[PDB]
Amino acid sequence: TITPSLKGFFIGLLSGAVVLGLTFAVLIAISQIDKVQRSL
C-alpha cells in the first residue's frame, strides 16, 4: 500500500537515476570520442 511519500521516495530514486544516468553516459562518451594522445 503506497502513501504519497512512497511515490516521492520512488521518484527520488528515478530522478536520481536520470541525472546519474545522463552524467555517466555523456562522460563515458566524451572520453571515447576525444581520445587521449599517447604512444608507447
Binding site: 504519497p4 516521492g8 562522460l27 563515458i28 566524451i30 572520453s31 571515447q32 587521449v36
Partner: protein
C-alpha cells in the same frame, strides 16, 4: 573504458576536473545559484516574517536566504517532500532553499577537499593543504548542522545573508554569552594570531630582501636556480632577537607553525559550538552569582554584561521568534532609568 575516462577527465586543462570534479562543480554551482537566486528573487516572510530579497527592495546586506519555519523541525523538505508536494513556488515560499544550499553546499566542501587530495597525488605533493581545510569544514558542519540539530529545528541555524549573520552573532551573545566560552576565546586567538603572523612574516621577508639584487632597485624578479631566494634569516633572527627577544630561525617550522595557529583555533571554536547545540554553555560563574545576590554593593564587568544580555533577550525575542508569539507589556521590559 575506465582508465580512459580517468585521463580524459583528469586531463590537465585550464580548470582541472578530477574524479572529485563531479561532486564539486554540480554542488558548488547550485549552492551558489541557490543563494544568488533567492537573494535576488525570494521573500521569506511566510516563514520568518522579514523581507528576504531585492524583489522587496533590501540592500545587498539586508538580502539573504532565510531558514525554514520552526514548525517543520528537521524535515529536509525537498521538492518531492510530502510537505511541499512538488510545487516549486511554495517549496521556495517555505524556505526549501536553505536545505538546498546547505546540503549541496555541504558536498561541494566535500568535493573541494577531495580535489585537494587528487592534485597532490598527480603532482606528487604533500596532502597538508587538504588537511588545513578541515577546520573550515568543521566550523561549517558545527555551525549549520550540528547546532540546528541539537535545537528546536532548522530555523535557529545561521541565515544565509550578511546582516542575517550579524543577527546570529548577537543572538549568541544574549542567550549563550558565547564570548565567555573559553573555546570561542582560543578560536579568537588563532584568527588574530593568523593575521599577526601574516604581517610579521610578510613584512620581515619583503624588508630583509637581498641588497642590489636589482640595479633598478624594484623587486619583480626570480628564477628556478634562485635557490637561495631573496632574503636573510640570519639578519631577521638578530633583528627579532634584539627587538622582541625570541626568534626560532628554521623556515620549515615558521611555516608549519603558521598552519597550527589558524587551524588549531577553528577546531576549538567548532567544538565550542557542538556544546551550545545542547544549550550547554559557559554563561555563568556560580561563585560570583552567589555573592552577587547576597550583596548589592558588589559589581564587576562580569555582572554588568549579564545585564545587557537580558536586555537583548527581552526586546529581541518577540519579533525574532514569531512561533511562540511573545506578548510583552511595556512595563515588563527591563529598562535603565531615562532610556
Amino acid at each position: 573504458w575506465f582508465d580512459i575516462l580517468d585521463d580524459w577527465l583528469k586531463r590537465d586543462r585550464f580548470v582541472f576536473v578530477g574524479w572529485s570534479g563531479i561532486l564539486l562543480f554540480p554542488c558548488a554551482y547550485l549552492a551558489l545559484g541557490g543563494w544568488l537566486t533567492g537573494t535576488t528573487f525570494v521573500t521569506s516572510w511566510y516563514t520568518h516574517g522579514l523581507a528576504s530579497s531585492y524583489l522587496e527592495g533590501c540592500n545587498f546586506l539586508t538580502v539573504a536566504v532565510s531558514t525554514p519555519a520552526n514548525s517543520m523541525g528537521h524535515s529536509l523538505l525537498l521538492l518531492w517532500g510530502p510537505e511541499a508536494q512538488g510545487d516549486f513556488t511554495r517549496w521556495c515560499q517555505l524556505g526549501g532553499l536553505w536545505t538546498f544550499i546547505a546540503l549541496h553546499g555541504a558536498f561541494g566542501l566535500i568535493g573541494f577537499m577531495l580535489r585537494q587530495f587528487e592534485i597532490a597525488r598527480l603532482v606528487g605533493v604533500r596532502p597538508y593543504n587538504a588537511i588545513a581545510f578541515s577546520a573550515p569544514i568543521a566550523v561549517f558542519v558545527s555551525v549549520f548542522l550540528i547546532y540546528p540539530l541539537g535545537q528546536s529545528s532548522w530555523f535557529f541555524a545561521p541565515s544565509f545573508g550578511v546582516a542575517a549573520i550579524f543577527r546570529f552573532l548577537l543572538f549568541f551573545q544574549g542567550f549563550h554569552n558565547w564570548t565567555l566560552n573559553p573555546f570561542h576565546m582560543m578560536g579568537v586567538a588563532g584568527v588574530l594570531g593568523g593575521a599577526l603572523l601574516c604581517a610579521i612574516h610578510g613584512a620581515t621577508v619583503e624588508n630583509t630582501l637581498f641588497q642590489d639584487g636589482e640595479g633598478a632597485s624594484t623587486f619583480r624578479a626570480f628564477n628556478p636556480t634562485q635557490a637561495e631566494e631573496t632574503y636573510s634569516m640570519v639578519t631577521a633572527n638578530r633583528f627579532w632577537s634584539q627587538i622582541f627577544g625570541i626568534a626560532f630561525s628554521n623556515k620549515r617550522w615558521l611555516h608549519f607553525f603558521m598552519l597550527f595557529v589558524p587551524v588549531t583555533g577553528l577546531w576549538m571554536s567548532a567544538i565550542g559550538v557542538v556544546g551550545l547545540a545542547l544549550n550547554l554553555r559557559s554563561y555563568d560563574f556560580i561563585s560570583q552569582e552567589i555573592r552577587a545576590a547576597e550583596d548589592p554593593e558588589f559589581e564587576t564587568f562580569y555582572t554588568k554584561n549579564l545585564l545587557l544580555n537580558e536586555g537583548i533577550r527581552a526586546w529581541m525575542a518577540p519579533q525574532d521568534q514569531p512561533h511562540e508569539n511573545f506578548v510583552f507589556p511595556e512595563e515588563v521590559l527591563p529598562r535603565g532609568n531615562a532610556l
